[PDB]
A paper describes a structure:
Antigenically sequence variable M proteins of the major bacterial pathogen [name] (Strep A) are responsible for recruiting human [name]-binding protein ([name]) to the bacterial surface, which enables Strep A to evade destruction by the immune system. M proteins form parallel, dimeric α-helical coiled coils which are attached to the bacterial cell wall and extend ∼500 Å into the extracellular space. The most sequence divergent portion of M proteins, the hypervariable region (HVR), is responsible for binding [name]. We identified [name]-binding in several M proteins that lack an M2 or M22 pattern, and determined the structures of two, [name] and M87 protein HVRs, in complex with [name]α1-2.
Numbering used by the authors:
A (entry chain C): 29 to 34, 37 to 39, 42 to 43, 61 to 108, 113 to 123
B (entry chain B): 42 to 78, 81 to 131, 134 to 135
C (entry chain A): 52 to 127
């Protein structure tokens, strides 16, 4: 029986690209940058987060883009 | 006392290091994730099978033409020898 | 910062390990495709020889048939 990857793999988890750097903010990596993992966003003191607070590596790419602080 | 300032300075530069070489390898890893898929090999084996079968078909047809050509000349040579014994006038 | 440096080190070491796994996966796949193409051409060349063998054996059989044909015509 010959199976196929649903994930990426000659007879593992897919990986999302680097999320970038959130200016006047912080990007928290909970686990890794692979498929299924999620990241969290926070802004600095006196900054409002305009956009999503989290983002997941969905089927691969980031579910939500980079938010903004002011 | 001044050691704590050196540990945080070393940890900060190390954090900016392991993150930076990750960014470089993450870009190169994307090129390796794409070259994995597969279709180039399935198309290579399928393309060679077509050219190889075109060789087996062109050669068999050429041999079948020569075999049919030999039989044609034999049937004509025997008919010529028959018309010669009939003329051989006594 | 110490926890940030250990996370990016552990994430690179996994990125480095998975890269070596993908490199060996493509290297073995590329070698197996070359071996499959070699068996395809080797199995092919065996079929060309079978066509030539049958062509020569049939052509040789036709020469012998024409010999027995004339010998049977001379006796009859
Ligand atoms: Ca960062
Ligand atoms: Ca605020
Ligand atoms: Ca390949
Ligand atoms: Ca030949
Ligand atoms: Ca007979």
């Amino acid at each position: 029986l010959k199976y196929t990857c649903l994930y990426v793999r000659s007879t593992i988890y897919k990986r999302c690209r680097h999320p970038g750097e959130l200016r006047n903010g912080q990007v928290e990596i909970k686990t890794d940058l692979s498929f299924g993992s999620q990241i969290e966003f926070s802004c600095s003191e006196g900054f409002f987060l305009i956009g999503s607070t989290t983002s997941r590596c969905e089927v691969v790419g980031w579910s939500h883009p980079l938010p903004q602080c002011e | 006392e001044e050691v704590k300032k050196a540990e945080e300075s070393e940890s900060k530069s190390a954090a900016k290091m392991w993150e930076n070489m990750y960014k470089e390898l993450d870009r190169d890893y994307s090129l390796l994730e794409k070259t994995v898929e597969s279709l180039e090999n399935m198309e290579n084996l399928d393309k060679l099978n077509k050219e190889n079968q075109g060789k087996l078909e062109k050669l068999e047809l050429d041999y079948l033409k020569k075999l049919d050509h030999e039989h044609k000349e034999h049937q004509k040579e025997q008919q010529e020898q028959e018309e010669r014994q009939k003329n051989q006038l006594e």
